[PDB]
Scaffold this active site. Sequence first.
Site, PDB file in Angstrom:
ATOM      1  N   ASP A  65       8.596  -5.629   2.210  1.00 50.50           N
ATOM      2  CA  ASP A  65       7.614  -4.608   1.824  1.00 50.50           C
ATOM      3  C   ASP A  65       7.241  -4.812   0.347  1.00 50.50           C
ATOM      4  O   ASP A  65       7.167  -5.958  -0.118  1.00 50.50           O
ATOM      5  CB  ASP A  65       8.250  -3.216   2.049  1.00 50.50           C
ATOM      6  CG  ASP A  65       7.226  -2.113   2.308  1.00 50.50           C
ATOM      7  OD1 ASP A  65       6.343  -1.868   1.452  1.00 50.50           O
ATOM      8  OD2 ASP A  65       7.328  -1.451   3.369  1.00 50.50           O
ATOM      9  N   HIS A  97       5.621   2.471  -2.130  1.00 51.16           N
ATOM     10  CA  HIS A  97       5.527   2.199  -0.713  1.00 51.16           C
ATOM     11  C   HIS A  97       6.834   1.765  -0.111  1.00 51.16           C
ATOM     12  O   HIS A  97       7.412   2.468   0.733  1.00 51.16           O
ATOM     13  CB  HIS A  97       4.432   1.169  -0.447  1.00 51.16           C
ATOM     14  CG  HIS A  97       4.093   1.057   1.001  1.00 51.16           C
ATOM     15  ND1 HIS A  97       4.766   0.244   1.831  1.00 51.16           N
ATOM     16  CD2 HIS A  97       3.183   1.762   1.785  1.00 51.16           C
ATOM     17  CE1 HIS A  97       4.287   0.395   3.078  1.00 51.16           C
ATOM     18  NE2 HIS A  97       3.319   1.320   3.045  1.00 51.16           N
ATOM     19  N   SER A 111       3.231   0.874   8.674  1.00 48.91           N
ATOM     20  CA  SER A 111       4.498   0.440   8.063  1.00 48.91           C
ATOM     21  C   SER A 111       5.584   1.492   8.212  1.00 48.91           C
ATOM     22  O   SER A 111       6.762   1.168   8.421  1.00 48.91           O
ATOM     23  CB  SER A 111       4.326   0.171   6.555  1.00 48.91           C
ATOM     24  OG  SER A 111       3.367  -0.835   6.313  1.00 48.91           O
TER      25      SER A 111
END
Length: 386
Positions: free
Chosen positions: A70, A101, A312
Amino acid sequence: MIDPPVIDAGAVPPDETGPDQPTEQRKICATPTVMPNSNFADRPWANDYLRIQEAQKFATGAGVTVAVIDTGVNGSPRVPAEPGGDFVDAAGNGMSDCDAHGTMTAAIIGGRPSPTDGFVGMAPDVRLLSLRQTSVAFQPKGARQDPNDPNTTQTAGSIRSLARSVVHAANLGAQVINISEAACYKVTRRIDETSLGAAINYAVNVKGAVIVVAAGNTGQDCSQNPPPDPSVPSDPRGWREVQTIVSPAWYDPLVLTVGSIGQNGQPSNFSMSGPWVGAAAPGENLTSLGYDGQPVNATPGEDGPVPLNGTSFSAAYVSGLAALVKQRFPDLTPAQIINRITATARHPGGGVDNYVGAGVIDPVAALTWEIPDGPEKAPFRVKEVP
């Protein structure tokens, strides 16, 4: 149109960290925030929807290592990630999240509980490994050598670095690998993906890791794929309709590709559809943990805070479930873990579709139902079906 991808098993890239091409900063580093009037004492909706509390009576992910591929993770006692390497910055170790994130992805997977709020991750006892492979703040720098060669695109660079990150995660001993990247390109623009297909086969079939990938979010790069054409019943998943390839999403069922649903249980408008989507999970208005391991449900936006949305995050829930399954049934292979997750899911009309695949995961069912294990490795052909 396009055919399912071919795997060239002997194209396994070297186990090396670092970006595909040298990078520099494009945006200021970002920080997660909160929505007005939030009450984090309440269980987040996804926790109730997925019956996480019930599920955790059967497993917590103890003894399992999950790699998070990620934007990096700013670690904390509640999100205690370990360095797994950096593929964006030549100097880096995966423990810096400049995008707001990866930290929240990791917390969904394995965030620890707290006495002072209602947030917990799917599998709060897992070991987390952070590999930064993607970033919007840090971007490949200089001019493209040849502006026409599809293999000199940022997408292609991202694909090649992802391949390396997968080999690396597998060699680090990850049993579950969550991939947030969804690289999108037109069916006309062919990118050499052979190293990615090889890295996936290596991680799954040689090293025994479950790989869970985001279906992708619509945006500038990812145009939504049309639905299957009812007129052609010899192509019911609509391979011939595909206009946007999404990778590694399209390596299904070697990987498990996860789309997003909202609070009402319906597929999210932004979730990329295609013949390779395999399951779905909450991906809207989520709660997750921030850089200090405190609850956060937003990131900053131009007209104020924007809720945590995306595939995600849906993938993160399913990676968390795979870790629960791995602890509870430690003899199951990656194929058998994926089978258990998809078989016990809440199937849509038609059994499988291009939006939710086999449907919304059901953790309690995945952890308790007795079903046939099925094949140890994903079945394959070496000769094409006419």
